[PDB]
Design a protein around this nucleic acid. Structure first.
Lengths: 136, 386, 65
RNA sequence: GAACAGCCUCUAGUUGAUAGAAUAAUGUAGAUAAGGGAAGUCGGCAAAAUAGAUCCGUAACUUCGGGAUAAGGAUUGGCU
RNA sequence: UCUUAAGGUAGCCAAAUGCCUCGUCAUCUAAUUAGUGACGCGCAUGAAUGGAUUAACGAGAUUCCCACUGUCCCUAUCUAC
RNA sequence: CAGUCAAGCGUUCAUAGCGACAUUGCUUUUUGAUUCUUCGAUGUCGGCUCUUCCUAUCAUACCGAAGCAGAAUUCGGUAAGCGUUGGAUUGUUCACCCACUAAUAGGGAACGUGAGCUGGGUUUAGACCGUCGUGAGACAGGUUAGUUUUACCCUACUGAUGAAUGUUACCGCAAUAGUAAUUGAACUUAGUACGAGAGGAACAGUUCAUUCGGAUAAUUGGUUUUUGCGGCUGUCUGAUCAGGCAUUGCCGCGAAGCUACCAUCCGCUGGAUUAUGGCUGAACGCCUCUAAGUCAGAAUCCAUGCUAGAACGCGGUGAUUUC
């Protein structure tokens, strides 16, 4: 990330520790994304790197196209399903955790996103909002 | 051999010992530095923490993604009925520190403030400051002499004040007595101020102005004897641990052949004296004013007290301060509001705050209504209201 | 600020209170509290829950409207 | 209720186990938990999930007897 | 042709038997001293000191997958004693 | 692990960075040698947990040097203040990969840590194999199964009382002890300096993270013996009611209390210095940051604040017993 992510992100209630399998919300041929690491994670003894909305993670494809399977690719979390608080005091959560495959620059591999996309993720990643359907 | 993996130490060694504070009322360990040019002013006030509530305000931060957008914020309400000045103290500086040379009291002292000096008040002859009052009642028979002593000496002057526990809705009837340092002008000017304010009651707005960054000094909530897991936040031992898991496994090496002070141990948690700084005053509300919880956006005749009253506390029929965030101490507890010890800008201290909405829904559950008017508007007529 | 309505119970939702839920079809359900949120997740019908605004409207209760 | 287990009750028997007060830590026994779901660990240890009955459906392999309750689905009250 | 008679056949194998060794190749994983399938000059496999295989069975040892979860991230709370 | 010398390497040029042939040392963290203590027993491997210490500094602060144009690097100084992770395989220490990271530095503390745990390994007794042995049996060869005891004493540590300082009450002072914050990214500077291009910064400012800490319960989530309200099964009270029992019968909601980077709030600014760069200036008519003197200056130190209050440190103040 860095020059790819647009602006900074308010801290979001972490919901996606390493080992979590989220849905793949794009049309790249992957069915799920398994989280192996998170970019920008801190170091603490016996603490899992966890992800949240708009976080860029390192992921593998456990179910999907064999061309995408068995390799490490960046992904961006677009739905969280773990309730988090906005600065306007509202607690909100999606029905599932979901992300999209992307390159390190943040450019998506797919060309469309199913389901809603979080506002924080859309703000951070303009291309995700570019290809998204509904931005909540 | 070394620690296999590095991790930060659990706890803060500067908040030791984690013992019970010497009293309920936390004292100001240090007052703001004195400047003679500024007018004579109180540097502290005493309030009673009533509870917390919610406010909504338009944030003004030029560069945040929430610039010019509504933000919801927790606030603490401190009921602050005006405190009575009774007496003053002068401190002469010595090569061993500040030493009080004399304390001059007021002519008449309130019944609550003498209840402070008593323990078995009802089975007492109430002989307290009677001979001092006899020493009083003249121009300067024995009082102008003590004041002149404080003027000739005593580079530091502090005024003795007490709270109006009777105004505050608790059951105590025993006022809290404290000192507040006068931090302006000359020592003579401070003594003049104290004399003028003898038996006079000072309101919170005179000392604290809105959008101030103040400190709260209070004794935190007590939680009794606590284990190390919660008292220090140490890692829990695995499930299959004989003889207990909420413990610290290795409490020391073989050498030195002692347990160190820095190893976490079980004991009292909470009821510690704390001084937490940089709390923003969101509102200084007047007691003699309906529509206390009314702002320029809401404009409803409602008071700060929630529906059914503050939980465990009651109402705010006196003056109050609404400060941003949380403060040390629990509800019903005496807290000390102290002026900041430094001039902080931060671009965040300087932020002028306009409240757009103050929550007054019931805190005794999930209250849906701000006022009984709104509750009746929603629910129409009930069977009990014939 | 503005006051939202409960998508289940039809109750006024002041700022901070309750939760927001985004369904798979990107439909927004705002709940005043965990009671209505849980009753919603339980696939319960507001028109059949007696104290609900929808129930009173269906049963012609509170005809003051 | 399939059932001399499981739960409750009649006959009969007992009401025996040092007590009172309070409700700190740490324990023993029993539980629950957002989001994740074995990342913990020597190792899923421990726990959770499954579970009765009816109907449907049931693979590889096989010593043709099994595997098999394979796997995997649906239903279950009360009243007339 | 020699040593004391013969000279490891069919099979099987880094096997509960392989030291070098975490063998080499493939597969399984993001990553595997693990697992499986192959290979075989096999220190030191091998034929009732039984070899190979095998449905069913197993509170036997091991690997993976689904389900499930406080094992864990990271702890919190409740009850009895 | 660190020095000294300097044949050479480095387009030339010993010493930017290296450096052979030699030679001087330090250390006791990853080996021996010895056999001084312990065989009327000091519980052994590893991990987990937690504290502290060293510095031979990986990162961060500030600097000096370069074969330093910028960027990135490399070599050093003061520096241990602050951090130094998540995982696949293995009982492993070690190892080796996948990643993240500012970085994934090295060590000690009876090869720290078993009345702290665990018990995977080793290393009792059962059993299998291979080789060896006629055999019983052997095998730092492999494999599987294999009881982890006691604290109530003293001290230490953590918290909690307390006799006597004429009595009692209130308000304080402050010796000493502790101390805490940390790191990164984005925007902007700026596609600018620099550079032939490719590339490509750095201070001031802003918004937020990371790690840590102290609180708090407005909100959200969690907990339910509120056995609060409702529902449900079996049975029992002769029967729609109202209840008992089912070791809290079960299910939904469930206030309050407690509580979560699963929630929110808050976490200060002055001085003296180190390295280093300087000023004036001798020694040594010149020169020279040093010799006398002196300016700035590091995450250092000491203060400011913060925690405790010396129960044999103290002050002020109120009242002090009518047959």
């Amino acid at each position: 990330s860095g020059n790819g992510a647009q602006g900074t992100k308010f801290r979001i209630s972490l919901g996606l520790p390493v080992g979590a399998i989220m849905n793949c919300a794009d049309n790249s041929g992957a069915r799920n994304l398994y989280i192996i690491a998170v970019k920008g994670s801190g170091s603490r003894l016996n603490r899992l790197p966890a992800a949240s909305l708009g976080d860029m993670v390192m992921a593998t494809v456990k179910k999907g196209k064999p061309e995408l399977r068995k390799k490490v690719m960046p992904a961006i979390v677009v739905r969280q399903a773990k309730s988090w608080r906005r600065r306007d005091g509202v607690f909100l959560y999606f029905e599932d955790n979901a992300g999209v495959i992307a390159n390190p620059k943040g450019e998506m591999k797919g060309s469309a996103i199913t389901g809603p996309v979080g506002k924080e993720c859309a703000d951070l990643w303009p291309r995700v909002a570019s290809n998204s359907g509904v931005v909540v | 051999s070394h620690r296999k993996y590095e991790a930060p130490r659990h706890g803060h060694l500067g908040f030791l010992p984690r013992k019970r504070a010497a009293s309920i009322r936390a004292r100001v360990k240090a007052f703001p530095k004195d400047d003679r040019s500024k007018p004579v002013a109180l540097t502290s006030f005493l309030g009673y923490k009533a509870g917390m509530t919610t406010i909504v305000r338009d944030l003004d931060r030029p560069g945040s993604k929430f610039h010019k957008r509504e933000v919801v914020e927790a606030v603490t309400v401190v009921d602050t009925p005006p405190v009575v000045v009774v007496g003053v103290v002068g401190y002469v500086e010595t090569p061993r520190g500040l030493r009080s040379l004399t304390t001059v009291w007021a002519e008449h002292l309130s019944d609550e403030v003498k209840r402070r000096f008593y323990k078995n008040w009802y089975k007492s002859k109430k002989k307290a400051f009677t001979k001092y009052s006899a020493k009083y009642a003249q121009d300067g028979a024995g009082i102008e002499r003590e004041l002149a002593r404080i003027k000739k000496y005593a580079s530091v002057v502090r005024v003795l004040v007490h709270t109006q526990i009777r105004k505050t809705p608790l059951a105590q009837k025993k006022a809290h007595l404290a000192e507040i340092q006068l931090n302006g002008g000359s020592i003579s000017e401070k003594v003049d101020w104290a004399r003028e304010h003898f038996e006079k009651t000072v309101a919170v707005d005179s000392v604290f102005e809105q959008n101030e960054m103040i400190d709260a000094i209070a004794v935190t909530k007590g939680h009794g004897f606590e284990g190390v897991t919660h008292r220090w936040g140490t890692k829990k031992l695995p499930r299959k641990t004989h003889r207990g898991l909420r413990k610290v496994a290795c409490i020391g090496a073989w050498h030195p052949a002692h347990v160190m002070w820095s190893v976490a141990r079980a004991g009292q948690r909470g009821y510690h004296s704390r001084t937490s700084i940089n709390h923003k005053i969101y509102r200084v509300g007047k007691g003699d004013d309906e529509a206390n919880g009314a702002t320029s956006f809401d404009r409803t005749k409602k008071t700060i007290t929630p529906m059914g009253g503050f939980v465990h506390y009651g109402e705010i029929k006196n003056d109050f301060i609404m400060v941003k965030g949380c403060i040390p101490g629990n509800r019903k507890r005496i807290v000390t509001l102290r002026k900041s010890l430094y001039t902080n800008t931060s671009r965040k201290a300087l932020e002028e705050v306009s409240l757009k909405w103050i929550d007054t829904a019931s805190k005794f559950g999930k209250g849906r209504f701000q006022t009984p008017a709104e509750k009746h508007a929603f629910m129409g007529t009930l069977k009990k209201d014939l | 600020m503005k006051v939202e309505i409960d998508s289940f119970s039809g109750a006024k939702i002041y700022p901070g209170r309750g939760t927001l839920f985004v369904r798979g079809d990107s439909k927004i359900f705002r709940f005043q509290n965990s009671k209505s949120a849980s009753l919603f997740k339980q696939r319960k019908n507001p028109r059949r829950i007696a104290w609900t605004v929808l129930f009173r409207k269906h049963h012609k209760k509170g005809i003051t409207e």
